[PDB]
């Protein structure tokens, strides 16, 4: 459902 591909990944 969550549509983000990179946004939710923390660097």
């Amino acid at each position, epitope marked *: 459902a969550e*549509p983000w591909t990179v946004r939710n990944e923390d660097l």
Partner: antibody
Framework: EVKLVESGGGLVKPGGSLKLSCAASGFIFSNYAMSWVRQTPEKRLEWVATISGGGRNIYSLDSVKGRFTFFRDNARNTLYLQMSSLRSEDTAMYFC???????????WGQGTLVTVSS | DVLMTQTPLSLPVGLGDQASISCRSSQSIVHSNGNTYLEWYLQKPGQSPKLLIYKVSNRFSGVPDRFSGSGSGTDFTLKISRVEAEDLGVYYCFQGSHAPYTFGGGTKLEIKR
């Protein structure tokens, strides 16, 4: 560098339809989600929708569900917004925009203008 | 839905001085992953919005450290230092933690002369 170019904006009558496109360049398109954001003539910003890298997972404003549809063609580096049942209030400048690690709206295009009236 | 409110509506400041802008959320904005996706945008006249600040206080590459954001819970603040004329335009806060994602109404920064 990263470039986004919207197109298709124009004059449409209440009730009508209109498809918009956002050509993307300078990055691997399928690797990132994209958003549509619109701005009213009096400058209010409103998120419309976000669609995942491969197109399967979409979110959208409830007031545009069913009338507006969102999809992308990765091999052609192009994102779409198929509009129908347009109303006065849909009138806005329409911007696509790419995600990035930690940021929603990292890169924006120039925008394409949709005017809904008769 | 989350409502995002900004104050003031506009703000004059002189060259060299510091502006300070508030953004308050009608409810908390911690994403299910425990992050807080509060972001700050600048739209200069005649142009598209550009990103300054993400996840409350991270400076996007290219953006000088005259700009920095802060705050928690429901209350955020963006601070511009050593203001130049080129910094004028409307500054927008945005929560991207709970759908539907919402922007504040904008704060116009005016440069005194």
């Amino acid at each position: 560098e990263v470039k986004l170019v919207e197109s298709g904006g124009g004059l449409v009558k209440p009730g009508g339809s209109l498809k918009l496109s956002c050509a993307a360049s300078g990055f691997i398109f399928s690797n990132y989600a994209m958003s549509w954001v619109r701005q009213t003539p009096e400058k209010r910003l409103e998120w419309v929708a976000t669609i995942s890298g491969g197109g399967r997972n979409i979110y959208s404003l409830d007031s545009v569900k069913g009338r507006f549809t969102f999809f992308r063609d990765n091999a052609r580096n192009t994102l779409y917004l198929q509009m129908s049942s347009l109303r006065s209030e849909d009138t806005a400048m329409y911007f696509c925009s790419r995600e990035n690690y930690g940021s929603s709206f990292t890169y924006w295009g120039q925008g394409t203008l949709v005017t809904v009236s008769s | 839905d989350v409502l995002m409110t900004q104050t003031p509506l506009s703000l004059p400041v002189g060259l060299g001085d510091q502006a300070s802008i508030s953004c308050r959320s009608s409810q908390s904005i911690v994403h299910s992953n425990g992050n807080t996706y509060l972001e700050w945008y600048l739209q200069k006249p005649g142009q598209s919005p550009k990103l300054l600040i993400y996840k409350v206080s991270n400076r996007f590459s290219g953006v000088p450290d005259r700009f920095s954001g802060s705050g928690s819970g429901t209350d955020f603040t963006l601070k511009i230092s050593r203001v130049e004329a080129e910094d004028l335009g409307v500054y927008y806060c945005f929560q991207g933690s709970h759908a539907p994602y919402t922007f504040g109404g904008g704060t116009k920064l005016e440069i005194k002369r």
